[PDB]
Symmetry: C4
Subunit: 349 residues, 4 copies
């Protein structure tokens, strides 16, 4: 979905005076056919009849005008009403797959001029936006709230399962009993969860000002999940991996690749092709997750800690003095590392 | 609900171009009477008047045609519009319990020809589908989302109670203090939960493409519940039971039998007839649940482990070497069994 | 709300053929005026004109008839349609506070005859039922689902807070550090929760068949809460209290009395009048809750256990042999008591 | 939003007979123009024509009258209907930004007289209230329930994250390993949560009687959160702070200031300007939170306890006799302090 078109969709998103007018028009079963231009003179050959207005835009004015037959011409910045009650005459030879004169005119006119045209028919409650060779149908808020509320409820269930997987993983991590199956299962659930977020994003955007609570909910449910998955990938990949690399593996499984167990464990660098194999592959966390998240050790410095001790298990055996040899670890960070791991072992295992 | 009819319901489920047309028609309070055939010539005696069209189907075309009186005839694959504005004349002597000419014609015509007929009346918002001697009323999405959203909320409450029962059961299992009441109570709640899933399934299907988020939610809430109940049955039945057997006992209590406490404990092989007796019956888990789920030991091999040690309590006493005598247990699986049980005992009991 | 009237409300609750007819009638903005009798002859002086039908009831027939002016007369069991299009002429001198002829007739006629009369006006979507001197307005399902869904969401929040209070209470109970404030706070939240249930009950009933999922949700959220509160009262009242007594104290605080902290602790037998005092009053559980709920000891027998040891703290000190002296405690129940308390102390404190 | 105007909004809030009338009027697409006065004679120059009624108010009467053209005049206490079908003639020179005669009259008339005027137009479903130079649009309940239900769902997600932050904080507090980042992160989430409450409050008020369940939900979700945040501020501010002071810092971050991490930690008295610094600042709780909340020690007395021991860590080392030296601590409060801390250390760390 081009960014060019997304800028146009903003024009009619909940919160704008234009959208407010269009909601009133839909509510009254008036139709609408609206043409957005910056220089009316340049387009005087596709504009016939009607009334020259040249007056400041308002929602109420647009509403009143739409009671009349034909079309309305506004400035692109939606600050002026230029014409009302006009006949729009785009080139009839331009292909269109729309139905009815109103929507066939709209799509032809947008194709012909490279401008936005908005059509509302009298009996439906959708707003059809046309820009160049684009068509975007904009939905009512109540339809969008419904899908988004469902998506959020779905995200809650994925997130709860993710937390359960993770808390079990933690236990296994601290006891050094993790298998590849355990990692992959946890990553998959994380990947799927953020996929759902990506898929609902267009709905969220369409909601405009009415999507504010929805965005807050997404943010709260997904807050640290991306960082968490990146750290897991750095901790459990077959060979050592830089952060931005792990970030890309996340990007890949969120958007382009399917998060099947074999696919994940393969891209983590393991050579398995049967799902049952994962249970037999023993893995040991590098320790990045615990270092950044719990001991609050910056990644740049955690590299050196992993450089020296290789795995979490060995880090958990190091004394404060042992840790202090690392490039970046003073007594502050050394006790942070030492005490936070041991605290965790005590309470969790 | 025959699979034959379910295939027909798909034709008008959310997501299809046909359903899209019918939603528009309902929205406009046009009526509709639609007859699905593959060879119009064969049915020319029940088709009178109207217009021969023989043109490609589209939703917009169907919508336009439905503005006219009478009926429309489409191909069974919904790829052609054959006739519009026709008079349908099924045998008047065919019994029908429908009301009004439109729906009496629809049901007679479907009975007579063995084909699908769809009726929409002008003032109601339901789609009535008729196939042979079948009638299926298809609901609007908003009605279906409402029931399904409620069903899901109900499932959440059952699932939370199930998790509480289970976590208590776990504690009892690990301390070897389980009574039959504890098992039965946990199975019952599990059985009821999956019953609710079975009952809402027809709603989910009716939702078609609009049921996608709903299916994801069901999947997340019920993910491992069936396996879990099967393992419980294998662990607590009076005498040893094969997996597929336990699977059938699950099937029975989900569909045909009522999950009353006495009924469950009876079919598990216990001879009680008063609910108060269950508290006095001491049981000891075989260990299948812990072996498959936590130690990741495949069922086929767990059989041998249960063969040798009989109960979880005895398995928890076995040393690695002890376990290693089993057909299938190498040092890997032996430490898996040993360490995962002891880890659990430590953290939970 | 008299049970007499509740039986009448059932006649028009979701799920009945009559309610189905009335929904169609409301949906079509026909009005309705319906008179329920068992012997039409006896009431021939209030019935004028119209058509004598004397035919079997169906929803579709009622719907069709309601297209005509005037009133319809059905049998009380809603199995016969007796009259349509009649003029109802109750005594004009009978007081009524209704508006419009339709509803003034309905209430006068019900008062005069002691029968049910149903009025639906054309522009509103409510069903007004009149029985004797009673009027009950029946709501649409969508209005009721909305309030009930909210009530349930509210119950979830009360229940979560109740579980938190209880789990803290447990800890305090097991360490013998409970204060009156802790008990009262927990009872209050429990009392309020079940009040909400009582208040939403009329909505649930009005929903009829459409209230099925709602009832399941209530049941899951409140399952053991009443028993739990009764046991708390038996454990913490100033002097010993029989079960049915504690049951009544529950009944009182659910229905007639306000669950303020002073009020609760006063009726539990404590002489405080300032809320700040509760923090200074030390209490020790009798042990009924733990005995019935965790050790599965029947109340009748728990009495003897409390008879002998007085408090949970002392019960937790008793050896198996010690416990075995009680009337009803064999080695089975003695280890149940002993082991379940100690297990709990280990895991929780 | 002036309290003066809020009193007027109450007049038309769900639950009032007036609001009930207006809902019926909106439902029937009648319009309404209603003028609230206490002495009709004083305003006889803006009231022309119509019918002098001088009769008791009821919703049904208002509904009936509104079927006529023009305006209705009620007493300010909404106990009398004075006029119906009148022509309202406010000074035409009074500025107004409203559209259509009905709403331009309403706003001019309210400005001119200092009284309330209510306008309902025929095609929209909003109630416009005008008081002096104020305009307040009152929404339908279904619109308000939607936003409020969303707000509550959002609050649930904030509250869960708050509980997670807090439980981690607790662990850190008890082990004396807290950093400023940990405090600030927890305060921020708390501040944001209560902001959401403040923002939804106007919606809650607009709901009137229909906001009852919504208020209960807010109360349950936010019950002790303010006290909790105040105690955190007293425990972690750079230098000692009185309760009412901490209360104001809460007030500030809820209403006027943005709860950014640097902003919070700055006003707590720490001199940081880079967010990454917070991880390196070690802090030790004074102990107010644990003293008031868990040991049930009144703040007034906790002051003396903090006076003597300075920090929670030192309080946790004190023996009963040690504690008893404090002004206000007898053996009761001394064991309360001692035992509740040690209990917590055992179970949590």
């Amino acid at each position: 979905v081009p960014q060019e078109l997304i800028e146009k969709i903003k024009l009619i998103s909940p919160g704008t005076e234009l959208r407010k007018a269009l909601d009133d028009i839909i509510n009254a079963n008036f139709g609408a056919l609206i043409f957005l231009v910056d220089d009316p003179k340049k387009y005087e050959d596709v504009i016939q009849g009607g009334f020259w207005l040249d007056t400041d835009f308002s929602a109420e004015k647009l509403y009143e005008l739409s009671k009349m037959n034909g079309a309305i011409v506004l400035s692109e910045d939606i600050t002026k009403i230029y014409y009302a009650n006009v006949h729009l005459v785009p080139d009839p030879t331009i292909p269109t797959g729309e139905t009815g004169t109103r929507h066939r005119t709209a799509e032809r006119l947008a194709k012909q001029t490279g401008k936005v045209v908005i059509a509302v028919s009298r009996r439906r409650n959708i707003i059809s936006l046309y820009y160049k060779n684009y068509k975007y149908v904009v939905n009512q808020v109540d339809f969008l709230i419904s899908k988004v509320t469902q998506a959020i409820s779905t995200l809650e269930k994925y997130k709860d399962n993710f937390n359960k997987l993770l808390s079990e993983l933690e236990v296994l991590e601290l006891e050094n009993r993790v298998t590849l199956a355990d990692v992959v299962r946890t990553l998959a659930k994380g990947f799927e969860l953020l996929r759902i977020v990506e898929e609902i994003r267009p709905y969220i955007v369409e909601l405009g000002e009415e999507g504010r609570l929805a965005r807050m909910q997404l943010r709260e449910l997904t807050e640290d999940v991306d960082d968490l998955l990146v750290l897991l990938i750095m901790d459990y990949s077959s060979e050592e991996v830089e952060e931005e690399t792990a970030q890309n593996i996340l990007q890949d499984f969120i958007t382009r690749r399917e998060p099947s167990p074999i696919s994940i464990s393969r891209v983590l660098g393991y050579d398995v092709q049967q799902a049952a194999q994962l249970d037999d592959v023993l893995v040991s966390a590098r320790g990045y997750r615990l270092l950044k998240t719990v001991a609050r050790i910056p990644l740049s410095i955690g590299y050196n800690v992993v450089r020296m001790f290789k795995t979490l298990d060995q880090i958990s055996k190091a004394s404060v003095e042992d840790l202090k040899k690392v490039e970046g670890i003073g007594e502050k960070r050394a006790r942070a590392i030492s005490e936070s791991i041991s605290s965790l072992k005590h309470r969790k295992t």
